[model samples]
Target chain A: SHMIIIKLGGSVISDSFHRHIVEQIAEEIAQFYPDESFILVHGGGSFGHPNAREYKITEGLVGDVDRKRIGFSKTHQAMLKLNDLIIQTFLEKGLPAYSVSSSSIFLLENKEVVYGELEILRKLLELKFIPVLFGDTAIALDKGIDILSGDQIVSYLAKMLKPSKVIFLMDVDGIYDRNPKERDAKLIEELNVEEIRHLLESIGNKLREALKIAKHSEVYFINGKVKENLGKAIRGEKVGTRLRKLE
Target chain B: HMIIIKLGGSVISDSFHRHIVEQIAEEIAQFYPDESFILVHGGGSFGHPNAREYKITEGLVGDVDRKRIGFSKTHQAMLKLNDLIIQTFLEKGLPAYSVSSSSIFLLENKEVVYGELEILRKLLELKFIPVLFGDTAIALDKGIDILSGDQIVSYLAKMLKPSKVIFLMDVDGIYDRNPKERDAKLIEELNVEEIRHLLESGIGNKLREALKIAKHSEVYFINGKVKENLGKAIRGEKVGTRLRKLE
Candidate 1:
């Protein structure tokens, strides 16, 4: 079976300022399904970030244990709800999109993923059903609560499942020479793993890591706000920023 | 006008579980739009028995134990029950979604140390009936432990601060003593102290504590088997035992 993994980032799927383009993405996936099987992962967009921030979940356990717990639980819940929305949209589009919970599958220790029971995701892929997941709150061993990023989850899956392609759809069109907010920022249409002029914080670093581990998979980072880019990426057209190894 | 309802494991895990669930769904639908509510359910056959078999709540003992395998199995079992509950709700025209307990909570010696629910709050605002169930959680000392549905109700009541909380058991409210023995009558009404005294069992102890945790909240216990009893409680008619602080 043709294996592809797609991630819908927070901006492309949803944000405080804009509604999600999930339906368009779902339509795109539906158009290519059966012919090309896929696994989906997503970020916690407006739906989750507010809650995560309201409580400051990613900062780890601090201050009053009660308030920290509240933030952690609230953030996880928000992610669950968002994941639900994506799953429902995919289901409605007549795709066999199954919600694969990250919390249940992965356990973190010292805020890094250490153990995974990935049979469920693997079987879903083998059975020809699309499995979907998102960055989730983790109960890290010894470390208490933790946050697992969607990019991290994708990275892990790429390592484990060895998918042929992993596409990242974000709010921005592509990776930029500098922060896109800057007036001089230019999109980096193609780049090798070692020669990046900029580090894109967690997202960029995670892609670099995923590229190292998921060597067999070609990766792309594109703007999900533009619906056509998803289909174009799936069709192997050079649409957005592509990350690869040395030729 | 928000409510929290807990469907006990017994009522939900019966041989005719589907029919039992459909009845409850029908009763809930009768007042749903007017009275927005959240549901937390016991694992019934799906969760507790399996947990007991694996000693999941006790956490893993020794360096190597079945606790690891059982932990995942217990959650998987609970989810099997959750989907059944969701389908029954959907069948009856209620837009119900599950907010799993284990995904959010971290327990310390069987008590919830970390978890404040925002998912249910957001779900209610969005007009979706958020359903939750008893399952397992990450333990600070133990790798994992069972977080019962009753405990889930207690925690949610504390955080979400629902106006009314109902526990739908197979029996009629709380008995002065076990009803199987003699004419042990149902305690129709009780203040804070009496509520605490009567409920020492695992299920009741958790519900008993909720009365204190949720200041603006009142707790009700009813026999869901009567169907009419749950409906009465939902409509604010005298149903079973009501627990509140003394005026």
Candidate 2:
């Protein structure tokens, strides 16, 4: 059976407009729930960062070891709380969703997935269970703990699972030539591997690095805040930027 | 590899008794800086009330859909409380890690048959204190079931072969009668045969059942509300009811 991986950004999931966007996405997923397989990866956004900062939890590997541990634990807890809300929303929409802890499933070394067992995930999918994952605090080989972003997780899983498509639901419509806030910035509707590589070299930012990892899958970025965009993208209606792999 | 502490609902980290919880966390941090510990906490006021309201913990009954909702809600509540405990521990400068019980545990015939524990071992080896709690778990016989924190501690102590299993309860220790009554007497120490007798005498409670599973490790029951009991128990001081295996 073909699978679809949907990565929900923290900005979309934790905003004041969250209920509307989540309902729309849940309704769309529910329509195809019975026949198709899906894996959801989510971000923490407002839920995690504020708490992490309050606890003085810094991102990446550099920080006071004790403070980093506190930050990691608090940040991880916040994400789990957000995940509960997301799963509950899906359930209310008559969708069966399971919250799978990213920390438990994958072993990371220096912010990269080094080992993971997918047997449980595979079994859940076979049973038509929609497994939900999120960016989380994970044990690092050199550092005591580190953050594993949902983008990296999607990239790793897309390569390993070879899902048919990987969709990222974000606040903005799609990738732009420059900052979207600028009126001169233009949305890029489609790009191949080489084009994306060139775009990354020009942009030279984190999103560019994330896109590089996302090259394994047929990636799409759509404005999930729009009511119809999510459904249209899911149905291959070309609602946003689609990234194709090298031939 | 050394010690496992089961923090109970009424006296430990429940919402109603958080000051006691914070005090206990501080004591652990200040006194036992170099010790290896695994914390297993109960659901207390956070979990059971919700589970009972939803009738989720009654062990797999009618209407699979409703049961699934109840399962989700119950598990969510437990995670919320577990997050509080983990955060509190972290705030006290302890390297506390949240190890979700639901993510790894699988039940069969109302008993936990499998759990992925290699990660727990790895974390403990690295000096990261692993904190686990009672949670809703997927059951092979039933759709879902609630696994108590006591059961989790019992299972872990048996598997890991810890040197001691310390139970932090509300009372001074296990008693021959209810401790609230003036005539009640604390049972300061007992052999396995005496515990088995207590179990057969019909006065046995949940703690008795847990003691049966903890046959290999020395088990103790101490009043967690008291300031120094946890540290004393951890240091092998004779401060509470100690249960020893009879040869």
Candidate 3:
């Protein structure tokens, strides 16, 4: 069976409005397409703040900065809590989901994905289970160990699973024509490669390093707060903007 | 200095012959406790045969027909193998890092354009092992293609100018003949001309090309299967074979 991966943003999980939307989407996923194998990945937003702020690990190791071991562990546990929340939320809706923390499986004292994960996920998927993976403080080969983002994890997974589709459930209704927060901000309904690149570059200034290395996937930046919208997008209703592969 | 070790896929993964190499790594860690290393292993056991069997080289180099699918699948296979190596090193308490070669580091026009070398060097400086592996990548000429670890290592060696280059292989050394049977014999030492001839035989694509560029650099070709051979080679003990610039 073909596999599909859905990434629910941290902003969605932290906000009550967004959480409601995510709950609805979870219900939709549980309702139909029960036979299809799925993997859910959640990000660290509000849940990650306690750790990211406390340890000041918002920006991952860019070059040679050695990460403190104690800080890394604390930050990791913070992200783990986020993963737990997502798993609990999905399971509460009767979704056969379980937390697949990257650190527990892939990051074994070193920041690397090992072979054990292959068997672990394969067995789970074979049983028609939904595996929920998330970003956490990773024990890396260098700089001791530090935090990695969900986007980076997804990028790595894309190369591994080559999933047919990657859906990003976010707080906005896709990227806007300009800074949506700014005056005269407009939503861009359709985006091409060039347009998307320009938009990313423009918004990068606002988002800073958060947008860095965000590779292209069949991402749907839907407002996870709008549960009906998320459900429609997942059902191929095309409710949000689509990022197509460059030709 | 950050060192990049590119193990030829043929030598390690030709038929899942990684046990020998794994043992060698273990021995090396035992020998070099403080020397940090970054490994850029080739897509040996995973994608070599598939690419060759599917005749995907042309597609890998220039064609677009199934290029996306071909490139991603081949790269995924490489990641799987990379995870295997990463796990092995981590279990030994060596900080072994695994990242897709192209994702963290990109090559422009078939050469490394931007690499997280500073990050790698910093990791090395801190006694952390940074492991990179060859995978399918977007090329200037070709949309997407496979990269050889040899190519990556050679580039890094020239860029970083490491003290030595070591190639761990199945053979004890370069041989005058196949050396698998009575008719074959080993060539303990080789100069430029001998290496050129051996490489022309087409058994080692990356080594041949690597030798061509790093002609002034010394390279050690040892039997990776021989436990502790890598340590011996690094110690300048005449282990498997030695290839050096013609004086």
Candidate 4:
């Protein structure tokens, strides 16, 4: 089998407790499915935002915003640090984890991802090595290249991997009919594709909008903080809000 | 026309030699202020020994090896060597910056490659010489490989379309045999076909490779140990072996 895809949100991996849970999930997967392959993708959370703000590198924007080149360097430093930690922890737990930067592996023409990176990923999977990718800005068409978000990564992976499942391990307990923190909110356990689309559209922020457009990927939004619960989601044990296509 | 100079690491870090390389570089800057130069020096004695010790040749197996954490130490060695050279040139009052080629350039099938020429061109326009060097690089075909200074010079010459390439080495010129050895005579000048035959026979070394590529472009090999010979070679003088094109 090729590998299923996992996108570790910047929020989840950046937190210690969340990291521990993700690590545990990885450990469980390694134990139960020795022959299975995984394609792990991560995002730049607090570590990446400071640099983005400092560099004024807003995605999908134009014009030269006063930016510090060192900001880019700092972002890389933080992400590499995070990536190294993840690789170390996974390897220590007996997983064959490898770190790969998107900037070096994939070529983007403007905002669109055009390079043939699937072959490289498949080869790694065939060898049973876990190749870790991250959210990165790459060379693009209009006025150089821009950053590709982790949410967008899901869309790209769906087009390439087309795995049976795409999991988003987050701090929340899955998507809600409304903001869960607000009074009288409800957890929508089984959302048909259209309901998920409307819910995602109601949310603010570019990442949310990007998630809205990722319709082709049947996503599982799990509460990453709940350690044991996270594994249940990956094992298809119905632990998160599973969004599927309409009949 | 833009000129690319590869300063081999051996020439920079050799304990047996004086800092004559820096002096030669200073002389070039002083004499040819109008000539825009793109500099690349080898990670010479400093980078290679440790790399060989660690058996980094495993990296050349695929691009994955070169980009992985296993090669981090090797990349660090190259960076340290680059810093030593960059700082040396800066101290001499020449504005030089290290352009880590592995970070900026990518090869396609070990042949076609792309570089951020805009940055290099901007540096040249601002009178700042862009310095590049051979390091463990991510190639399209092979993963991580030792890119020689000769290879860099050829690639850059082809891409930048420089007026000429001046190779400064320990020897004065390319001879029918090693000039340092007996029965070897220096060949003053040669047509394209004559030099092509010598290279085809695989009789010459790295310097021969430099001369061979320079056949399509212009190339002059001078005795770098003799500081004054550098300027003389660039001036299109008959100071070193001149490999010319056949009319």
TM-score of model number 2: 0.86
Query: Lowest lDDT 10-mer window, candidate 1 chain B?
Result: B63-72
Q: Residue B187 of model 3: what lDDT?
A: 78
The superposed Cα distance between candidate 1 and the true structure at residue A217, in angstroms, equals 15
Residue B157's lDDT within candidate 2 is: 68
Pairs of residues at least 3 apart in sequence or in different chains that clash in candidate 1: none
Instruction: Give one digit per residue, the lDDT tens place, for model 3 in A197-247.
Output: 676665342122123223433555666667676566556667767655434
Which docking class does model 3 fall in?
A: incorrect
Model 1, B1-247: lDDT tens digits are 8888888878888643787788888888788678888888887877877788888766657522345445655665676678677867766767676566765576777778777354445456545577788877667677667887766776776677788888888888877767787878888885666656656446466555556544757778898777778788877788788877334
Q: Taking the candidates one at a time, how many backbone clashes does each contain?
A: 0, 0, 1, 15
Q: Report the number of the highest-DockQ candidate.
A: 2
Each candidate's iRMS in angstroms?
Answer: 12.4, 2.0, 12.0, 7.2
Model 1 misplaced stretches (Cα beyond 4 Å): A1-247, B63-65, B196-207, B210-214
Task: Write the number of the candidate with greater DockQ, choosing between 2 and 3.
Answer: 2
Q: Every model's DockQ, to 2 decimals? A: 0.04, 0.41, 0.02, 0.12
How far residue B83's Cα lies from its native spot in candidate 3, in Å, is 1.3
RMSD (CA, Å), candidate 1 to true, equals 13.3
Worst 10 residues of 4 chain A by lDDT: A64-73
TM-scores of the models, in the order given: 0.56, 0.86, 0.57, 0.63
Given the true complex, what DockQ would model 1 score? 0.04
Cα lDDT tens digits, model 2, A129-234, are 6889998877766665666778768867876887877888888888887678888978889865566666667624335534654555567788888878866776
Q: Determine which window of 10 residues in candidate 2 chain B has minimal summed lDDT.
A: B201-210
Native A-B interface contacts kept, per candidate: 0.01, 0.36, 0.00, 0.01
Off by over 4 Å in 3: A1-145, A150-247, B1-4, B14-18, B53-56, B60-65, B104-116, B180-182, B199-201, B204-207, B213-216, B245-247
